Swiss-Prot record:
Outcome of substituting C12S: Loss of catalytic activity
Binding site for isopentenyl diphosphate: H41, H74, H124, S225, S226, N227, S269
Activity regulation: Addition of Ca(2+), Mg(2+), Mn(2+), Ni(2+), Co(2+) or Fe(2+) decreases the catalytic activity. Addition of Zn(2+) results in complete loss of activity. Is potently inhibited by substrate analogs in which the hydroxy group in HMBPP is replaced by an amino or thiol group.
Effect of H124N: Loss of catalytic activity
Function: Catalyzes the conversion of 1-hydroxy-2-methyl-2-(E)-butenyl 4-diphosphate (HMBPP) into a mixture of isopentenyl diphosphate (IPP) and dimethylallyl diphosphate (DMAPP). Acts in the terminal step of the DOXP/MEP pathway for isoprenoid precursor biosynthesis. In vitro, can also hydrate acetylenes to aldehydes and ketones via anti-Markovnikov/Markovnikov addition.
Protein name per UniProt: 4-hydroxy-3-methylbut-2-enyl diphosphate reductase
UniProt-listed Pfam families: LYTB
The organism's place on the tree of life at top rank: Bacteria
Catalytic activity, EC: 1.17.7.4
Organism name: Escherichia coli (strain K12)
Cofactor binding, per record: Was shown to bind 1 [3Fe-4S] cluster per subunit. However, it initially contains a [4Fe-4S] cluster which easily degrades into a [3Fe-4S] form in the presence of oxygen.
Sites where the protein binds [4Fe-4S] cluster: C12, C96, C197
Length: 309
């Protein structure tokens, strides 16, 4: 059987930056380093950092005075940021720049008392952080997950209305939600398309090509990785058996038993080593040399703050 690898796949610029921030802080200050939320949604990465002295928390109260605290790549609300500021803490912000960009727009609409709508998944830390940039009771900040949510939403002033999105959404589904928003609120404003980042768009494009060729698709990523979930979902919708997996140990032989061609990709938070071990396991199951698919070349890098080298 043939093993195909999607391209691109794996680490994006924001994830690589966030991890490097925690690593460098550990190196520079030693353990412990506190981190608000899993730095990226990958078990392998988080487990490793935890063993190295990082302690992952959700609320600032669980952090002691005089600590070093890092905000995860997904971002935090203004309330969290302020609580951190009011406490005696040294703070580093690993929030991806492409998340921050969305935050700035929500904060602007808040200042104007003008309503905003976020497309995203309820309960996700990025959504909590982005909705948490809005604090004007005179305006409004509304979450929609689907066209149905749009069909039910009422707002105070549809003449002064904008939208923003989560960075890791399904490209296809988000298109449908925007279409709905513009039909219901013809004066709504937003970006030219959405706030889905290059990495999300690119990895979804790449898994679409992969799924066209492969019969089964393995997506390396943790259960709580939204972008990784969208990749598995995309392949399933195309009629392929697709599995979200943390590592090679998760591979059940029945999945690939009589399969001529298996595809592998990885979400934005999954390190390459996990992919190499997945490939190694597929080769034990009859696979050959992994063939990388041709794909769009990414070139963006986000540097760590100077203070962290
Ligand atoms: C930090 C971030 C994506 C990187 O992947 P992740 O850590 O798996 O997170 P998400 O669940 O996809 O948001 C959202 N911009
Ligand atoms: S998925 Fe996109 S927005 Fe999120 S960290 Fe990676 S590059 Fe940044």
């Amino acid at each position: 059987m043939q093993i195909l690898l999607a391209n691109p796949r794996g680490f994006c610029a924001g994830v690589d930056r966030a991890i490097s921030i925690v690593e460098n802080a550990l190196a520079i200050y030693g353990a412990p380093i506190y981190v608000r939320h899993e730095v990226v949604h990958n078990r392998y990465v988080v487990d490793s950092l935890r063993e190295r002295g990082a302690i992952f928390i959700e609320q600032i109260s669980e952090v002691p005075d005089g600590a070093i605290l890092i905000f995860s790549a997904h971002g935090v609300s203004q309330a969290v940021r302020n609580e951190a500021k009011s406490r005696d803490l040294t703070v580093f912000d690993a929030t991806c720049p492409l998340v921050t960009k969305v935050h700035m727009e929500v904060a602007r609409a808040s200042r104007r008392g003008e309503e905003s709508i976020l497309i995203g998944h309820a309960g996700h830390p990025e959504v909590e952080g982005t909705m948490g940039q809005y604090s004007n009771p005179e305006g409004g900040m509304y979450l929609v997950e689907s066209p149905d949510d749009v069909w039910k939403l009422t707002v105070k002033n549809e003449e002064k209305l904008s939208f923003m999105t989560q960075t890791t959404l399904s490209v296809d589904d988000t298109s449908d939600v925007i279409d709905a928003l513009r039909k219901r609120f013809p004066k709504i404003v937003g970006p030219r398309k959405d706030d889905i980042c290059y990495a999300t768009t690119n990895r979804q494009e790449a898994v679409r090509a992969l799924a066209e060729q492969a019969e089964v698709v393995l997506v390396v990523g943790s259960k709580n990785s939204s972008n990784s979930n969208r990749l598995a979902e995309l392949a399933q919708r195309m009629g392929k058996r697709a599995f979200l997996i943390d590592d090679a140990k998760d591979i059940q032989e029945e999945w690939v038993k009589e399969v001529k061609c298996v595809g592998v990709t990885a979400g934005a938070s999954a390190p390459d080593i996990l992919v190499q071990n997945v490939v190694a396991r597929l080769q034990q199951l009859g696979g050959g040399e992994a063939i990388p698919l041709e794909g769009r070349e990414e070139n963006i890098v986000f540097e760590v703050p100077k203070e962290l080298r």
